[PDB]
Amino acid sequence: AAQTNAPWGLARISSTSPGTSTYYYDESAGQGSCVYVIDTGIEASHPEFEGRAQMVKTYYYSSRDGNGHGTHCAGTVGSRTYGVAKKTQLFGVKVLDDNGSGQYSTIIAGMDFVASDKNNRNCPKGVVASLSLGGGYSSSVNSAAARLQSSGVMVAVAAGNNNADARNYSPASEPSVCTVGASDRYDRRSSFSNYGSVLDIFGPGTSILSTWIGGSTRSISGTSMATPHVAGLAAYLMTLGKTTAASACRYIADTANKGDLSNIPFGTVNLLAYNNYQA
């Protein structure tokens, strides 16, 4: 399939070169593959989710996304226009209140929830978790992400937006999950993007246009925007049978675009998420 005038991020994951505007992808588009968006929630009623998104769990008075960040990241995973896997079940786990904040215990509970609640969902192609959140290092947050990964879910996490080395941030520093850095449309490491040896892949992270609350759209920047690209890519690749949850991050790193990003610090992988779809 070909989505013309797609967001540059979608066109980039399907491109060996920057500066193109068409997103190419197998029409399966993540059909049968679930992605948990562990964030501020998902405005499931957004027409861009076209019935495929629902809230499955909240730790606050409401499951309404009153922030927009979770709706934005869910839109990058699997919205019809701004999504990587345009046919994927999306599940909202509101571990962040509408200010975008959340106790680590709540975030840990949400990850353990996904590890169990995937057995309550129909994901024959496999399960992905998009964690567009991060704080200082926490071995309990890391181990919770490791549990989620070891349960049979891909865990894609944001490297962080501190322009620092992501070993000091959780769940970014958990080695078993997939730590995603951010790039811009000129194949530059996003100025905010965290780096370091723990990073596994880079996704489009600067000026990412996706869904927003109020049935709208908007463009924002963050590794927390590159993470749904990789999460949606994994769901896309798992539907195609290219890889599994335990192997998706490795597979994405093997099939990525190599050495195409600039301002990648020495020791950080120069890998850009690439669906390697040939129309």
16 among the known binding-site residues? yes
72 as an active site residue: the answer is no
112 as an active site residue: the answer is no
206 among the known binding-site residues? no
117 among the known binding-site residues? no
14 as an active site residue: the answer is no
Query: Which one is catalytic: 39, 65, 165, 184?
Result: 39
The answer to whether the beta carbons of residues 167 and 196 sit under 8 Å apart is yes
Query: Which one is catalytic: 33, 132, 224, 229?
Result: 224
Contacts (Cβ under 8 Å, ≥6 apart) of 191: 163, 206
The rounded distance, in Å, linking the Cα atoms of 203 and 236 is 15
The answer to whether the beta carbons of residues 46 and 65 sit under 8 Å apart is no
The answer to whether the beta carbons of residues 245 and 206 sit under 8 Å apart is no
Query: Which one is catalytic: 46, 69, 72, 229?
Result: 69
Give the N- to C-terminal CA distance of the chain in Å, as an integer: 7
Which residue intervals of 48-154 are DSSP H helices?
Answer: 69-78, 104-117, 139-150
C-alpha separations of 88 from 71, 85, 124, 210 in Å: 15, 6, 11, 16
Length of the chain measured in residues = 279
177 among the known binding-site residues? yes
Catalytic residues: 39, 69, 224
The annotated binding site is made up of 16, 175, 177, 200, 260
Q: From the annotation, which residues make up the binding site for Ca(2+)?
A: 16, 175, 177, 200, 260
